[PDB]
Design a protein around this nucleic acid. Sequence first.
RNA 1: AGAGGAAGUAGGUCUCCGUAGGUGAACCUGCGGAG
Length: 175
Amino acid sequence: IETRKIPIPPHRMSALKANPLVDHCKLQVRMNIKEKRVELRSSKYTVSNEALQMGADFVSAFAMGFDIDDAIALLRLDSLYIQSFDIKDVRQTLGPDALSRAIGRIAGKDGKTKFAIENATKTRIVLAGSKVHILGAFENIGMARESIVSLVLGAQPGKVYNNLRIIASRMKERW
RNA sequence: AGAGGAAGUAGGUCUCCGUAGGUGAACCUGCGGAG
């Protein structure tokens, strides 16, 4: 019998108050968003370390910014992965015009560029300053990774988008 | 002005916060800060 306790950000707390995980994976939950903790306790109906770990990864992802839909998608699909990427990792220039210019290049106005990337490589990301959080199958995650590191290198968004399109297409092909 | 003659050229998204206004709890808008 094992228990996992997870801290939350103050951002998502109303959505956390919005609702079921005991029904989902038979694992008793306590919540206290004032100590920012969520307790996940294995009952006699909880069977697997797999179930505890997926509940933990799921609540951490929903806390880290994705919503209930891709969240229960991550719940449902054990193939799906998560990755947290800081913009402060490997860095092309030491100038601290990094964050503003870079994440402007990432989103574009109205999230056009990020959303084109989403509809291309079939992932789900969220952008908040230094962190970007990426969700889905790891190879798509890696394509998006190479895309974004090229974008923060400064490549033309349409150009890297085209390359991303064709690479995603040949990935999506089987033979 | 005149018919003739004769030639040549053809790129800040999402969440949260602090603001000002709106129709007020909420909520919307805009500004300014954090993830």
